[PDB]
Amino acid sequence: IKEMPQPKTFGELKNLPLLNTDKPVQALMKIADELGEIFKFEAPGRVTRYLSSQRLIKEACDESRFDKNLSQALKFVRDFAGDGLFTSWTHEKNWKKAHNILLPSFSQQAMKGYHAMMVDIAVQLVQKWERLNADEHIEVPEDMTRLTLDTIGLCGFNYRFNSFYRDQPHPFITSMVRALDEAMNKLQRANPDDPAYDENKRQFQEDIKVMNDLVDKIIADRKASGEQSDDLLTHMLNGKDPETGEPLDDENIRYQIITFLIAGHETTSGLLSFALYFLVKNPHVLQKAAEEAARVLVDPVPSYKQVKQLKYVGMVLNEALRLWPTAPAFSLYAKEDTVLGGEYPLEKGDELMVLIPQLHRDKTIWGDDVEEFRPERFENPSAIPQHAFKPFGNGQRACIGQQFALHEATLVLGMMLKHFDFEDHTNYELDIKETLTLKPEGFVVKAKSKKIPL
Ligand code: HEM
Ligand SMILES: CCCCCCC(=O)N1CCC[C@H]1C(=O)N[C@@H](Cc1ccccc1)C(=O)O
């Protein structure tokens, strides 16, 4: 048994001021590069251990020994996402109940039903870029977020945010982004009771009110209708849990919709943004992915079956997820006293944080070239060891949206590569903005149309 290292301390504040930065995940990555596969992080009244090696992460991903923890970040998001799937404990009745009801709606099979709605929004993105003037550029994360929000609104509850018709976000989105900003900011606060934070806390309560009032209104309007579209809202209003035999109540449905809207906005848009960044920085890879898009997507409207054929586009997406997993951390707690890695004794209730970007840089798994963008790493899926690659988290608490996000991302990236050539006209310097998720801030390109009809 060894003592684990710990980064620099600030007297009574222990390690907390290390998070007083707009880029805390990148700060922890640098600390993991300095200290290795595990380090202790202490705040007043809180300890956790940050894991970076596949060797220790594979044990942490043992569901007999560790369960999902709500990190302080997730506890703050729980104030508006409630006992939705993402911010519920595994042992809350509503976790398993929602999981059983929603799993069939998120299966690879269910994507056949969502495809047409995804195509509707993808075509709006292509038409936006087709309509830019010669002197204009693309704001990549801004347009990817317009797309992913609209896709989940239309597949989520047959609601059009119409993001490609606006500069100013939909009211719900203003409240949701500001609520997320508050929850991630609260984490850092030396002194949270400080009066400088009074306006933030008043605002926070106001935004919770906006999100609930508006989602409850869609639920209530849909019950009034009788209308039965093929969206998640229908499946949740009709579905019964086979275990309890109960449907979700309206309050929990509202938490599920807020939860799905957070995911659309934050994660899939990050992935598409990083994928396009790595493609314009790696022209040989861009050529191989655009060859596939041009050969496979032979119809003006892509089919489900054609999107499944974009294998190299899927490898590009996996390699962007390896370098910059847009949901970069998840938290676990010890179910019982146990010994991590033959060396680090833990007590029942002790917390671990999985630092996914660091896991994805483990040279003992990936080789010496870990900073290089090389989608060929993913040629043969079965060559990647268990728990080496975890952009969608772990086990029964893994991302329920994984098939949805990768279907949307492959469809959209395929269409972008078919329809346009891309220039890195500013020689963009990567600047990663941290919200709930990671996105490349200020990433812009120019698209030269290949003039292929829709
Ligand atoms: C590239 C896109 C996405 C990534 C990288 C991603 C990543 C993740 C990760 C790492 C987790 C586990 C979090 C934890 O253990 O605390 C998770 C959970 C979840 N994600 Fe995603 N996600 C993505 C897209 C989506 C989408 C599109 C949806 C739904 C519309 C979604 C819904 C969820 C839900 C509901 C959970 C909670 C599942 C449960 O515990 O039962 N995600 N996601
Ligand atoms: C599904 C993606 C959601 C990611 C949530 C944000 C997150 O995990 N963050 C954002 C900041 C860095 C990292 C983290 O280590 N979070 C810890 C930070 C921490 C706070 C207080 C004490 C110790 C650690 C936590 O939220 O618990």
* Nearest-ligand number for the alpha carbon of 331: 1
Structure tokens at 208: 């919770």
Strand blocks (E) in 210-358:
329-334, 338-340, 344-346, 351-355
Indicate whether residue 270 lines ligand 2 (CB < 6 A). Answer: no
The active-site residue, picked from 87, 145, 148, 267, is: 267
Which of 85, 78, 82 minimizes the C-alpha distance to 103?
85
Contact 355, 52 (CB under 8 A): yes
* Nearest-ligand number for the alpha carbon of 398: 1
Q: How far is the CA of 145 from the centre of ligand 1 (A)?
A: 16
The CA–CA distances, whole Å, from 377 to 145, 365, 366, 368 equal 28, 11, 8, 13
Resolution (A): 1.8
Structure tokens at 439: 């996105």
Q: Residue 170 in 3-state DSSP?
A: coil
278 noted as active-site residue: no
Q: Name the closest-CA residue to atom 2, ligand 2.
A: 327
CA distance 118 to 409: 10
Region of 65 (left: φ > 0; alpha: ψ -120 to 50; beta: rest) is: alpha
Is 399 annotated for ligand binding?
yes
What DSSP character marks residue 429?
A: P
Structure tokens at 309: 């054929």
Instruction: Count other C-beta atoms under 10 Å from residue 339's C-beta.
Output: 12
**Sign of the four-CA dihedral 166, 171, 172, 173:** positive
Residue 160 makes CB contacts below 8 A (sequence gap 6+) with 150, 153, 154
Pocket of ligand 1 (CB under 6 A): 68, 85-86, 99, 152, 259-260, 263-264, 267-268, 271, 326-327, 330, 391-393, 397, 399-401, 404-405
Contact 299, 307 (CB under 8 A): no
Q: How far is the CA of 400 from the centre of ligand 1 (A)?
A: 6
Contact 410, 307 (CB under 8 A): yes
Which of 407, 361, 112, 390 minimizes the C-alpha distance to 268?
407
What DSSP character marks residue 268?
A: I
Domain boundaries, the chain: 1-454
CA distance 12 to 387: 36
Q: Name the closest-CA residue to atom 21, ligand 1.
A: 399
CA distance 329 to 336: 22
CA distance 282 to 276: 10
CA distance 200 to 174: 14
Which of 358, 278, 288 minimizes the C-alpha distance to 319?
278
CA distance 83 to 3: 37
Q: How far is the CA of 401 from the centre of ligand 2 (A)?
A: 21
267 noted as active-site residue: yes
* Nearest-ligand number for the alpha carbon of 72: 2
CA distance 216 to 380: 46
Structure tokens at 194: 């400080």
Q: How far is the CA of 72 from the centre of ligand 2 (A)?
A: 6
CA distance 184 to 186: 6
